[PDB]
Design a protein around this ligand. Structure first.
Ligand SMILES: Cc1ccnc2c(NC(=O)c3ccc(N4C(=O)[C@@H]5[C@H](C4=O)[C@@H]4C=C[C@H]5C4)cc3)cccc12
Ligand SMILES: [Zn+2]
Length: 206
């Protein structure tokens, strides 16, 4: 049937919950805003629920992970940012299209970290039209996803990895003095479901 995008109304508590998580998880980064831009809030202009009967591939894998993890799939809602959001919502996450950065699909609990990836690694060259990484005009997109972490392997760097170590299902790169915030990585596209599609703009500091 394909993906059906359902619009959430801002007066719906599901809409508010999603925006709140995004707006409150904004943190300042050490790069002076070079990658994701300079801003204190987002102008959330749209939130759509992604419906794709993907859910099954996702639920199936979740069962495998659970058996393998003492009946604990260890789900977390996390943000994802990359230049391939539209492909993802239709075809699902795919580890074959993966790219420091290893060969995994990255997620973050802080929206501002995922915003740095919207136009690519380090923000790339910025938006296609103005080639500005701090564009306040162009609409950006990011996903708030269900991520099956199962047994996570914790470490200080992930540029090295291609797969989760034995007995594990995800890799969490953590802060050193190295990273500033945690990054969650999976190596199988089916361990993540693109629950919400957020359309937004970063707003200039008032
Ligand atoms: C048709 C089609 C064409 C191109 N793509 C597709 C796709 N794509 C992913 O599922 C994907 C996106 C970004 C990363 N991906 C990350 O999450 C990390 C790195 C990376 O490449 C760098 C960027 C974000 C950070 C840093 C890894 C995987 C999924 C489904 C279809 C696709
Ligand atoms: Zn722009």
């Amino acid at each position: 049937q394909g993906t059906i995008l359902l619009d959430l109304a801002p007066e719906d508590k599901e809409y508010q919950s999603v925006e709140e998580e995004m707006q409150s998880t904004i943190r300042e980064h050490r790069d002076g805003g070079n990658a994701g831009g300079i801003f204190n809030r987002y102008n959330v202009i749209r939130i759509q629920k992604v419906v794709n009967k993907l859910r099954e591939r996702f639920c199936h894998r979740q069962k495998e992970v659970s058996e393998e993890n003492h009946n604990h799939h260890n789900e977390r809602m996390l943000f994802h940012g990359s230049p391939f959001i539209n492909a993802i919502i239709h075809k699902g996450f795919d580890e074959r299209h993966a790219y420091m950065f290893g060969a995994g699909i990255y997620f973050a609990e802080n929206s501002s970290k995922s915003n740095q990836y919207v136009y690519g690694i380090g923000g790339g060259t910025g938006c296609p039209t103005h080639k500005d990484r701090s564009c306040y005009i162009c609409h950006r997109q990011m996903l708030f996803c269900r991520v099956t972490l199962g047994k996570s392997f914790l470490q200080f760097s992930t540029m090295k990895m291609a797969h989760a170590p034995p007995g594990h299902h995800s890799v969490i790169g953590r802060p050193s003095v190295g990273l500033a915030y945690a990054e969650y990585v999976i190596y199988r596209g089916e361990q993540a479901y693109p629950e919400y599609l957020i359309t937004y703009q970063i707003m200039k500091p008032e």
